[PDB]
C-alpha cells in the first residue's frame, strides 16, 4: 500500500501534464472555456463545460513562481518549506491522492502549461522566461460542493443543529485520518478549506499548499537515515494565525529573540543536530492541533482564543493554567463532558503524541444521544 513519497508524487503529476493547447474536456477545447473568477500570487476560477454539464475549478500559477519552487523542491527532495503557498507540493499532493487515494480531494483532471519529467518542463519554462514569455501552470479539478463557511451561512438564513455539527466534525476527522494514512499533512485546516456536498454530508479537503510529507528518510534536512521517520518542519507560519499551534509560536519567539530573520538561510549551514532540534516541530501533531481548533470553532460558533500563544493571549494562558483541559476550563465547563474529552486528545501534546486518529474516530462521544 503505497504511501506519499516525492518520487511517486512527481511520477503521478507527469501523467497529468500537458500543453494547454492540446487539452479538450468533453468536446470543448480548453481555449474555449468561459472562466469566471473566484495578495495571492495565484488566481482561481470556476468554469462550466457543456458536452455532461460539468463544473471545474482552475488554479493558475505564474511559471516564474513555479520554476523557482521546483528548483528548490528538487534541491530538498520534496522537503522545501515556506510560510506562503508551495505550488509544486500542492500539485504533486493532488496528483498522488487522485491516482492512489480517491475521495480525499476533489477529482484532479490535468496540469497544464499555458502561454518526460518535471525537469524537462523546467528546462523549457526557463528558456521561455529568459525570453520574457510569461505563462501559467494550470491545475484543473472537479468543483465539489461548497465550503463549510458557506454551508453554515446558507442554512442559517439558531446556529446549525448539534446533530449537524457532529456529522461535519466526524467526516473531517475521517479525512485527516485518511490523508495522514496516504502519507501527507494539510497544515491549513479551516472552514474555507473543507468542502461539503448536498449528498449525505459527503466532504473533501481543499488547498494542500501548506502540505508536507508526513514521513522522511532525512534527519532534519541533512543526514540520510536507514529507515523512515516522522517529518519535522522548521516553518512555524502554517495556515491561518488563529489555527497556529503553540509549539509553532514557541519557535517563532525563538527566531525573533535571537534575531533570526531568515530561517531557511540560518539553518542552511548548521550541522550540529542539537541546535537544529530547537527550531523544529512534529508536523502530524500540528495537523491534530488545527483539527482541535476547528472543533472548538464549530462547537462554539466562533473562536474562544485568537492565537495559541500565552504571551499574546490572556484567554490561551487560562486554557494552559488549567492544563489544556476543557472540563477544568471556565469557557467550556458546561459543554458535554465526552466532547471536551474528545477535543483534549487533539490539543494537549501528550495526547497528540500518543492518541491515534483511528482511535478518536471510535471515541464514545460519536455515539451519545443528540
Amino acid at each position, epitope marked *: 500500500s503505497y504511501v506519499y513519497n516525492w518520487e511517486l508524487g512527481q511520477k503521478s503529476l507527469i501523467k497529468m501534464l500537458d500543453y494547454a493547447d492540446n487539452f479538450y474536456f468533453n468536446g470543448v477545447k480548453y481555449s474555449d472555456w468561459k472562466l469566471t473568477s473566484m495578495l495571492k500570487d495565484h488566481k482561481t476560477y470556476k468554469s462550466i463545460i457543456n458536452s455532461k454539464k460539468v463544473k471545474l475549478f482552475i488554479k493558475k500559477i505564474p511559471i516564474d513562481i513555479w520554476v523557482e519552487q521546483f528548483n528548490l523542491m528538487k534541491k530538498y527532495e520534496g522537503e522545501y518549506l515556506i510560510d506562503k503557498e508551495n505550488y509544486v507540493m500542492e500539485a504533486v499532493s493532488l496528483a498522488f491522492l487522485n491516482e492512489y487515494y480517491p475521495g480525499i480531494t476533489p477529482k484532479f483532471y490535468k496540469i497544464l502549461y499555458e502561454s518526460q519529467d518535471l525537469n524537462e518542463l523546467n528546462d523549457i519554462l526557463t528558456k521561455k522566461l529568459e525570453n520574457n514569455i510569461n505563462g501559467n501552470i494550470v491545475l484543473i479539478s472537479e468543483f465539489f460542493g461548497e465550503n463549510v*463557511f458557506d454551508y*453554515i*451561512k446558507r442554512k*442559517k*438564513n*439558531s*446556529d*446549525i443543529s448539534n446533530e449537524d455539527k457532529k456529522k461535519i466534525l466526524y467526516n473531517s476527522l475521517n479525512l485527516l485520518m485518511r490523508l495522514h494514512n496516504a502519507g501527507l499533512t494539510h497544515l491549513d485546516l479551516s472552514p474555507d478549506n473543507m468542502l461539503i456536498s448536498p449528498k449525505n454530508y459527503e466532504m473533501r479537503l481543499c488547498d494542500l499548499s501548506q502540505s508536507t510529507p508526513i514521513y522522511t528518510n532525512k534527519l532534519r534536512h541533512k543526514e540520510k537515515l536507514n529507515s523512515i521517520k516522522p517529518f519535522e518542519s522548521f516553518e512555524p507560519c502554517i495556515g491561518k494565525i*488563529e489555527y497556529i499551534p503553540p509549539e509553532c509560536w514557541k519557535i517563532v519567539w525563538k527566531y525573533k529573540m535571537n534575531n533570526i530573520k531568515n530561517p531557511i538561510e540560518y539553518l542552511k549551514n548548521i550541522s550540529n543536530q542539537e541546535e537544529r532540534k530547537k527550531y523544529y516541530y512534529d508536523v502530524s501533531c500540528a495537523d491534530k492541533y488545527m483539527l482541535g481548533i476547528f472543533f472548538i470553532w464549530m462547537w*462554539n*460558533n*466562533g*473562536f*474562544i*482564543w*485568537k492565537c495559541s500563544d500565552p504571551i499574546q493571549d*490572556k*484567554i490561551f494562558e*487560562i486554557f494552559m493554567k488549567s492544563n489544556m483541559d476543557l472540563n477544568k476550563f*471556565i*469557557m467550556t465547563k458546561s459543554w458535554p463532558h465526552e466532547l471536551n474529552n474528545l477535543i483534549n486528545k487533539l490539543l494537549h501534546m501528550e495526547h497528540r503524541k500518543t492518541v491515534k486518529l483511528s482511535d478518536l474516530s471510535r471515541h464514545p462521544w460519536w455515539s451519545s444521544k443528540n
Partner: nanobody
Amino acid sequence: EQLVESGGGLVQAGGSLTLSCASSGGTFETYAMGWFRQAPGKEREFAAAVSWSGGSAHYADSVKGRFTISRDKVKNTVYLQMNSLKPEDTAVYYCAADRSYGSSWYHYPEDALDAWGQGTQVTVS
C-alpha cells in the same frame, strides 16, 4: 474606526431605544459583534454580543430579559433593541467586533478586542 454607531439618545424611564452598529467591508464577516457600556467612574462592562453567523447571542445578567440583539443577513451590522430602560442603564454604549465569541469577552482585557467603536450616549430620565 470601522465600527460606526447610531441610535443613541434620551428616553423616558420605561420606554425604549435601539442602537445600530454597521461595519463596512466584508472583513468582519467572520467576527462576532456586540455592545459594552461605560458610566462616569464605572469600568466598561459587557452588554450583549452575537455570533458571526448571527445564530447565537448572549447577554449580561442585568439586562437578560429587557434587551435583545440581532444581525443583518447581508451586511455586518447589529441592532441592540432596548426595552424597559432604567436609570441604571444610563451609559455610553460601545460597539465591539472580535473573532472570539462567548464569555471570552468578559475576560479579555479591553485593549485586546479586535475592534472598537467611538461610542453613543444614552440618557434615561
